Design a protein around this ligand. Sequence first.
Ligand SMILES: *[C@@H]1O[C@H](CO)[C@@H](O[C@@H]2O[C@H](CO)[C@@H](O[C@@H]3O[C@H](CO[C@H]4O[C@H](CO)[C@@H](O)[C@H](O)[C@@H]4O)[C@@H](O)[C@H](O)[C@@H]3O)[C@H](O)[C@H]2NC(C)=O)[C@H](O)[C@H]1NC(C)=O
Ligand SMILES: *[C@@H]1O[C@H](CO)[C@@H](O[C@@H]2O[C@H](CO)[C@@H](O[C@@H]3O[C@H](CO)[C@@H](O)[C@H](O)[C@@H]3O)[C@H](O)[C@H]2NC(C)=O)[C@H](O)[C@H]1NC(C)=O
Ligand SMILES: CCOC(=O)c1c(CSc2ccccc2)n(C)c2cc(Br)c(O)c(CN(C)C)c12
Ligand SMILES: CCOC(=O)c1c(CSc2ccccc2)n(C)c2cc(Br)c(O)c(CN(C)C)c12
Ligand SMILES: CCOC(=O)c1c(CSc2ccccc2)n(C)c2cc(Br)c(O)c(CN(C)C)c12
Ligand SMILES: *[C@@H]1O[C@H](CO)[C@@H](O[C@@H]2O[C@H](CO)[C@@H](O)[C@H](O)[C@H]2NC(C)=O)[C@H](O)[C@H]1NC(C)=O
Ligand SMILES: *[C@@H]1O[C@H](CO)[C@@H](O[C@@H]2O[C@H](CO)[C@@H](O)[C@H](O)[C@H]2NC(C)=O)[C@H](O)[C@H]1NC(C)=O
Ligand SMILES: *[C@@H]1O[C@H](CO)[C@@H](O[C@@H]2O[C@H](CO)[C@@H](O)[C@H](O)[C@H]2NC(C)=O)[C@H](O)[C@H]1NC(C)=O
Ligand SMILES: *[C@@H]1O[C@H](CO)[C@@H](O[C@@H]2O[C@H](CO)[C@@H](O)[C@H](O)[C@H]2NC(C)=O)[C@H](O)[C@H]1NC(C)=O
Ligand SMILES: *[C@@H]1O[C@H](CO)[C@@H](O[C@@H]2O[C@H](CO)[C@@H](O)[C@H](O)[C@H]2NC(C)=O)[C@H](O)[C@H]1NC(C)=O
Ligand SMILES: *[C@@H]1O[C@H](CO)[C@@H](O[C@@H]2O[C@H](CO)[C@@H](O)[C@H](O)[C@H]2NC(C)=O)[C@H](O)[C@H]1NC(C)=O
Ligand SMILES: *[C@@H]1O[C@H](CO)[C@@H](O)[C@H](O)[C@H]1NC(C)=O
Ligand SMILES: *[C@@H]1O[C@H](CO)[C@@H](O)[C@H](O)[C@H]1NC(C)=O
Ligand SMILES: *[C@@H]1O[C@H](CO)[C@@H](O)[C@H](O)[C@H]1NC(C)=O
Ligand SMILES: *[C@@H]1O[C@H](CO)[C@@H](O)[C@H](O)[C@H]1NC(C)=O
Ligand SMILES: *[C@@H]1O[C@H](CO)[C@@H](O)[C@H](O)[C@H]1NC(C)=O
Ligand SMILES: *[C@@H]1O[C@H](CO)[C@@H](O)[C@H](O)[C@H]1NC(C)=O
Ligand SMILES: *[C@@H]1O[C@H](CO)[C@@H](O)[C@H](O)[C@H]1NC(C)=O
Lengths: 317, 318, 318, 172, 171, 171
Amino acid sequence: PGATLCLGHHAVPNGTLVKTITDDQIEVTNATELVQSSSTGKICNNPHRILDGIDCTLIDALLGDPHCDVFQNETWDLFVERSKAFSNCYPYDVPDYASLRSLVASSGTLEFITEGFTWTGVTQNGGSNACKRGPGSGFFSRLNWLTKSGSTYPVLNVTMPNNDNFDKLYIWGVHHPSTNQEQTSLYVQASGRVTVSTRRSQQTIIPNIGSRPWVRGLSSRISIYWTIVKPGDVLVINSNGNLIAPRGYFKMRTGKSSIMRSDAPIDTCISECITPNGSIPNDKPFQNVNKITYGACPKYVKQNTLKLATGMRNVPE
Amino acid sequence: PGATLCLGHHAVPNGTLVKTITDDQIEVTNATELVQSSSTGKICNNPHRILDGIDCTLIDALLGDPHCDVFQNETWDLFVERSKAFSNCYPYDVPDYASLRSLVASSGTLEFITEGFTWTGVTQNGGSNACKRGPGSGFFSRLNWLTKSGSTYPVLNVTMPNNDNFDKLYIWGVHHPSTNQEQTSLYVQASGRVTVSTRRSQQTIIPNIGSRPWVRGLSSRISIYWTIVKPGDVLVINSNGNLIAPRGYFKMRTGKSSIMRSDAPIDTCISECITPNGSIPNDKPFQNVNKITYGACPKYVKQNTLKLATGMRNVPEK
Amino acid sequence: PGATLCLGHHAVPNGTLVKTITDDQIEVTNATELVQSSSTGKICNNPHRILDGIDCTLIDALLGDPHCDVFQNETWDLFVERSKAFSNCYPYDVPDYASLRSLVASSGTLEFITEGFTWTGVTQNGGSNACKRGPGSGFFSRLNWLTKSGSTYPVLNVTMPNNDNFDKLYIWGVHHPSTNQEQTSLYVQASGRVTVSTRRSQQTIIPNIGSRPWVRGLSSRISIYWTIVKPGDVLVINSNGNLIAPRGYFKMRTGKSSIMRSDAPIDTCISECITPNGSIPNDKPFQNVNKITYGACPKYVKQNTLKLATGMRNVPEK
Amino acid sequence: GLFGAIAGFIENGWEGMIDGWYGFRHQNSEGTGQAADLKSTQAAIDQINGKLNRVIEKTNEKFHQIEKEFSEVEGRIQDLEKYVEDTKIDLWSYNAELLVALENQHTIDLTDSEMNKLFEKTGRQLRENAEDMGNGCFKIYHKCDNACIESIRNGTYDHDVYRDEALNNRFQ
Amino acid sequence: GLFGAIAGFIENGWEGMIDGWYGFRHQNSEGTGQAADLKSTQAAIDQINGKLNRVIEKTNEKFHQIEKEFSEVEGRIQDLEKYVEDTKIDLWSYNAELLVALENQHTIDLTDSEMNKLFEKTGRQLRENAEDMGNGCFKIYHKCDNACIESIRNGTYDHDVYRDEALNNRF
Amino acid sequence: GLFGAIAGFIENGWEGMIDGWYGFRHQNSEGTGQAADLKSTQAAIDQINGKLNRVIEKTNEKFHQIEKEFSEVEGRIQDLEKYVEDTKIDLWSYNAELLVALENQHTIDLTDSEMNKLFEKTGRQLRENAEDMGNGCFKIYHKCDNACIESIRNGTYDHDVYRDEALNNRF
Ligand SMILES: *[C@@H]1O[C@H](CO)[C@@H](O[C@@H]2O[C@H](CO)[C@@H](O[C@@H]3O[C@H](CO[C@H]4O[C@H](CO)[C@@H](O)[C@H](O)[C@@H]4O)[C@@H](O)[C@H](O)[C@@H]3O)[C@H](O)[C@H]2NC(C)=O)[C@H](O)[C@H]1NC(C)=O
Ligand SMILES: *[C@@H]1O[C@H](CO)[C@@H](O[C@@H]2O[C@H](CO)[C@@H](O[C@@H]3O[C@H](CO)[C@@H](O)[C@H](O)[C@@H]3O)[C@H](O)[C@H]2NC(C)=O)[C@H](O)[C@H]1NC(C)=O
Ligand SMILES: CCOC(=O)c1c(CSc2ccccc2)n(C)c2cc(Br)c(O)c(CN(C)C)c12
Ligand SMILES: CCOC(=O)c1c(CSc2ccccc2)n(C)c2cc(Br)c(O)c(CN(C)C)c12
Ligand SMILES: CCOC(=O)c1c(CSc2ccccc2)n(C)c2cc(Br)c(O)c(CN(C)C)c12
Ligand SMILES: *[C@@H]1O[C@H](CO)[C@@H](O[C@@H]2O[C@H](CO)[C@@H](O)[C@H](O)[C@H]2NC(C)=O)[C@H](O)[C@H]1NC(C)=O
Ligand SMILES: *[C@@H]1O[C@H](CO)[C@@H](O[C@@H]2O[C@H](CO)[C@@H](O)[C@H](O)[C@H]2NC(C)=O)[C@H](O)[C@H]1NC(C)=O
Ligand SMILES: *[C@@H]1O[C@H](CO)[C@@H](O[C@@H]2O[C@H](CO)[C@@H](O)[C@H](O)[C@H]2NC(C)=O)[C@H](O)[C@H]1NC(C)=O
Ligand SMILES: *[C@@H]1O[C@H](CO)[C@@H](O[C@@H]2O[C@H](CO)[C@@H](O)[C@H](O)[C@H]2NC(C)=O)[C@H](O)[C@H]1NC(C)=O
Ligand SMILES: *[C@@H]1O[C@H](CO)[C@@H](O[C@@H]2O[C@H](CO)[C@@H](O)[C@H](O)[C@H]2NC(C)=O)[C@H](O)[C@H]1NC(C)=O
Ligand SMILES: *[C@@H]1O[C@H](CO)[C@@H](O[C@@H]2O[C@H](CO)[C@@H](O)[C@H](O)[C@H]2NC(C)=O)[C@H](O)[C@H]1NC(C)=O
Ligand SMILES: *[C@@H]1O[C@H](CO)[C@@H](O)[C@H](O)[C@H]1NC(C)=O
Ligand SMILES: *[C@@H]1O[C@H](CO)[C@@H](O)[C@H](O)[C@H]1NC(C)=O
Ligand SMILES: *[C@@H]1O[C@H](CO)[C@@H](O)[C@H](O)[C@H]1NC(C)=O
Ligand SMILES: *[C@@H]1O[C@H](CO)[C@@H](O)[C@H](O)[C@H]1NC(C)=O
Ligand SMILES: *[C@@H]1O[C@H](CO)[C@@H](O)[C@H](O)[C@H]1NC(C)=O
Ligand SMILES: *[C@@H]1O[C@H](CO)[C@@H](O)[C@H](O)[C@H]1NC(C)=O
Ligand SMILES: *[C@@H]1O[C@H](CO)[C@@H](O)[C@H](O)[C@H]1NC(C)=O
């Protein structure tokens, strides 16, 4: 005499719990994870140019520590610094190390152009057994340790104009001897002075004599400074002792390059997103691996999981 | 022997595409734009007091570079710096330049109060052909270049108390000669020192001798420093050479004043919101013109358009 | 002959106004408040370890100003600084005061360990009537004023290695005398020098002679500096005059400690959230009391009220 | 509201319903009465307690924050500290305003929905024995004493028992 | 939409309805006609205006700003100024995208809901005198001249007057 | 859900419905059967794919970030670098929590709504030939073989063909 027609919907035996506005936990038929929380453990070498520093920090490759001179004229998208890196040259410090490391990393290149500086009246190419280059004593490849010639150290006053159309980065330094005898024996003057200037900026450094802890045999130090010369401006170096002179400039670029600290191995794979833990997929909108990232990356969140329902409420009974 | 009554809604031949949670593009009958993306290209001169620093930066007007003398005692809500500005006085630098430029821009006034400093034993009002005032030599209007008198440059030791009920801003400097000859000819001592202090703070600067690139004839330099003295505190200046002295103080204010870099011309109109591109209306909630703004402004977003539906879904056909 | 069955919902004579997406004001039967806007006015002394500095700032307790020595070796979750605090020792300044105050506050401890420095050739334990300790002259408890012994002041060159497994915080200073007579009468050399170094860092200070504003009898100053020595590193102090020496180190900790400026009295009660106005309950998600907070606290918002609807729309009449 | 019941086809609420959020009023041979519906009342209450507990879930806990009041003019670093704090406060104020607006709109919509759901469940229990009068009331076309009304309210009314009597009154 | 009327059981909208958002079309013995419903139209317009007024409410005014363009490389603190401003712009860009997405989804759902509410109201006025044809139309089983149609549109239709005639034609 | 169908007047779902999200089950003179409804299934699936595609749109690329881990104690500037980054992470964590909460609420409501839309559509197709049993099932008051059922599922059922038989059995 009749029939029954019933409307219904599907269900599954075990669904997924999700959160809503009203519920901490409600079961739906299906959900997808929005938080990337795993890594392969490896940094993929494509599509970004990875430069593995191995034993070298970026600043040591910049200055030209001999065991780092393999990195001369290198470029990178991401420079990777390893925790095993070590210095093996003259002991030094960089006031505002972090800023110098940052602007070089952001520039993305160690392109160095040698310039013809004339150091009238001083001995050039000073070296040290703390910084061996081959069997013999040596120095940073990009710096020029100037000392007295014969028995005088004249007032150096040299200039170098920037007629190019890019910015020039000059890295230079000041020597801090540990005794007065060393000071006079190198720079026949009791108090040195280094003044490096352009048209709109200037720096004057006065060395400091005194003992510091021994590093690689030495209780003296070198201090690293930098100067940028824009197109049309002039560089002027004026010193009456203790100058660690530049041999040229590094070419400044702007772009998407940076630097990262990581001990993760580099592998041959593809991954747009890099973290210090390794590369991660960027298909999910959020990630929990590391707040430090490079590339096109999911946004970092504190949650280790976030399930987005892709199905209806699961009512198996 | 009946009737039909049908319910329905309107439609239009073509509506507007908008975005929803589910749809990148869905058509509704009408929408309104939420992102301001155009400007007149001009800065309106009301209701904010706009001050055009034509050829002058705020710091050069502060110190008193001579072609900036027109700005003495000026006030602003918004000071506008032009890219064509230039310095034409003694070559100088300001360590932490941005900070001085910001605190002066935020103070909103160049009101200068000349004070009776006594500089016993030195020559005052030194000048230079790098800073011409007319055809003759000159200097910053608010700074006092002190040099030797006769054959001595004594130790200066002056004090100046703040008995008012506002903060005083002192601008002073240190001279960096290019030769030892210059140093001793101007200040007889062979190495100077400038020490400026209040009761709880101090700054001591040691000049630096050396050749620098020629600027307007000179290789020497001046470095600019500032000091704020609060009510009840006192200023103490102690120098045995190379001091570029204050002539008085700038009066400090707090308020809504600021500074902007812009080459847009000023115009006679009314607009609460200013950007370096010009004034923009502030009726929409978001804007795409410039992240740099002044006044009551829409919030800057990356989108150039955002359409809010103001009507129902447009379904002209099945 | 039948029956009527009516469905309905409740209502109350007057409910609460709340805001929605559509409506600025719509009436619901009940609502609860989400913005904490009041305080008892008192800081609760539980569960956080509160340390009331009373008359002492954290830096004055750190250096060892005598009336602050009651704070030696103290620890805190929250150090509270009072506006009535005063200094009562040798006049001083701290370049980057805010950073030192911050790293000490975050460390949460004034644990001090005396170390056996050997100061060969100088007089130790200098004092001043600007800094009385009891009836007699004195000095900061944690600093050592070294002066000439007999008629010479040698080049001091001492070292102190860190063989522990925690970081050491060294506080030291440089003396700035007000006259050349003072400089030579205390240190033989006419110009002092202080160099403090580790393996990867160094700082050298050159004193500067001259008068500063008169403070508690003195016109000279001490400048405070600090140095952290990591496990395996070594401290090296090199000075030929003007050194204010350390007596030991402060032990560095990491944790949840901080500092707050407040005049709110401390009370014996329980509250996880502290503001300069006093403790506030943290059951509501937002607060309007102070942007400065310590503890598990509601987020600061500009609104003084935000009502979350907890019942249906209130429709007592058509 | 979206569902058209509260402040809709139900003209107004009942200030006289004091033991529930939703319920029934009846008129039959034995008189008039009122009774709260517990399931719908509790459903709305459970949902609102649910969202209230999500909103009050563990609140922030930071200990060392930056300085936020300053006694001296300093320039660039202090300008950035203040700008970071003004930016954060604006963003959280926006979150709090939007949070309660969305929550309130949804609370109004779910309470309206629970009303409509209760009305439709009742209509489905009556099966040709009643007609919807358009104001939230059902006209019931048979004798329905207090036990019969109660059987509607507790979900056990059997429409077949009354179908013949009701159809006869509805259409003739 | 969630309620299934607009772009749902109502096949399409009416480009010919130009004086309202919702309304009625009829066929009876005296012909065919169209009339807007004012109350539904105004309910939708008031809700959308309300939401529009909240969106352009209290925005705007300053508080001091930092620098956002830089002419010289500086390192650490310029890097922080730029990161602060990029982070702020990204968070506001997200707020604006989501605000417009949620608001638009809600405008579509509330307009669909007003259509459905007017449909249910009309059906409730007819009480066994009509059948729902499934396309937003009612078949009215009695003679309904223009005054009777207008009595439906203005909420004064008395179903008992026509119940006997209609019940006879339905059954 | 807001519409009262899923986990409402539909008592439970069907683990045996494998080829659709919504559908029909029938019992008639020839036996029992089941069929997915492709239009309502695809409407839910298209909406969820829409939401899922919008969520993974513009969530990406940044190149210069500030430093976020520090090997030395430094005070003020490092304190601000850390506060900016903690502030940023807290704001994005909140955005992510709220986004997923609202999306999930909306997904449950729209799938509940499609179930209700399909039920109402089927009830409107049967026009006095059937009664709503209150649990998502219609009692059909006429002989309804497999072809008749299939005509209901594919939207070509002509209610007039069976109206007389059905009205006769109902009343
Ligand atoms: C100022 O004071 C400083 C500290 O007292 C003086 O520096 C110390 O002076 C001695 C004498 O020259 C140096 O001795 C050298 O040190 C190296 C390194 O020894 C370490 O390594 C070896 C091998 O691993 C290990 O066996 C030791 O135990 C040490 O751990 C020796 O290898 C050399 O042969 C030589 O002895 C100190 O190293 C040096 N240290 C420091 C920290 O300065 C300084 O000379 C004083 N200056 C003046 C002007 O008086
Ligand atoms: C140290 O070296 C610097 C730079 O090499 C020397 O600066 C140079 O000084 C000369 C002579 O004063 C300047 O010459 C001038 O050029 C202008 C044209 O621009 C001309 O009209 C003048 O009559 C004058 O001859 C030259 O411009 C300047 N160069 C730079 C880059 O500043 C400086 O003189 C040297 N210091 C010492 C103590 O020798
Ligand atoms: C596009 C900008 O939107 C908003 O900023 C706000 C808006 C408009 S957007 C909005 C729309 C519906 C509900 C809530 C917010 N309203 C209404 C606010 C109300 C308060 Br109180 C408030 O603090 C803010 C935040 N301001 C200070 C940054 C807003
Ligand atoms: C999960 C976070 O993803 C997003 O932030 C955005 C997302 C995805 S989240 C979302 C989902 C549905 C509706 C609106 C936003 N979309 C679509 C954006 C669109 C624009 Br324009 C946009 O500026 C942003 C902001 N980016 C630049 C930080 C987003
Ligand atoms: C008013 C404060 O809101 C929130 O902060 C959060 C809230 C409460 S507001 C809210 C309400 C309903 C749904 C989602 C969020 N919940 C639940 C969070 C859950 C997680 Br996981 C989370 O990271 C946060 C973010 N915190 C760490 C900054 C919140
Ligand atoms: C649960 O939902 C996810 C996401 O909607 C489904 O995963 C998709 O599967 C299809 C085909 O299998 C792929 O084309 C998509 O790329 C997948 N999306 C994602 C985000 O992974 C999954 O199939 C669903 N599971 C069930 C049992 O229905
Ligand atoms: C390092 O790179 C720089 C720049 O790429 C080299 O200098 C350029 O050399 C090329 C070819 O020799 C010339 O065409 C360019 O004109 C040079 N640039 C400038 C600014 O002079 C430099 O020679 C490279 N050094 C090494 C060792 O490879
Ligand atoms: C990615 O690497 C970071 C840093 O190595 C890990 O974070 C640390 O995890 C350890 C172990 O739980 C904790 O003790 C540290 O406190 C964490 N440090 C920081 C800075 O967060 C992180 O767990 C790693 N994650 C993955 C997925 O590999
Ligand atoms: C407002 O002015 C800014 C700055 O001049 C413009 O932004 C620049 O646009 C050009 C061309 O699109 C780019 O090359 C620059 O890189 C942009 N600068 C920045 C900082 O973004 C902007 O286009 C102008 N807007 C309007 C509406 O005129
Ligand atoms: C908590 O204390 C703060 C600071 O003392 C109060 O904020 C001040 O309030 C007065 C009057 O409302 C204003 O004139 C000041 O400008 C405010 N200062 C700041 C820094 O905002 C705040 O009102 C107090 N709150 C409560 C609830 O007592
Ligand atoms: C809807 O289903 C009906 C019933 O199955 C279809 O009508 C029958 O189709 C079969 C196979 O094509 C024929 O053998 C019958 O003769 C048809 N019966 C009638 C009365 O036409 C109908 O074609 C289907 N319609 C659509 C649009 O799919
Ligand atoms: C579209 O909406 C806006 C805002 O409500 C209104 O001013 C405008 O007139 C509308 N346009 C049309 C064609 O209705
Ligand atoms: C600037 O203002 C002060 C006080 O208002 C006044 O004494 C001084 O003369 C003014 N200077 C000029 C150039 O107007
Ligand atoms: C409740 O009181 C307020 C006054 O605060 C009034 O505006 C509002 O209309 C009242 N509500 C009712 C339902 O009477
Ligand atoms: C109003 O809501 C709060 C929070 O749910 C509750 O504690 C209170 O009892 C409610 N008030 C009334 C009158 O129901
Ligand atoms: C202070 O604490 C340290 C370790 O916490 C201890 O070695 C030292 O002796 C203490 N000093 C005093 C005076 O208690
Ligand atoms: C429902 O009410 C009827 C009549 O009052 C009663 O007989 C029956 O036991 C009740 N059932 C339940 C489950 O309460
Ligand atoms: C409704 O329409 C009828 C015409 O059919 C008219 O007589 C009556 O007055 C109207 N009522 C109202 C309230 O407009």
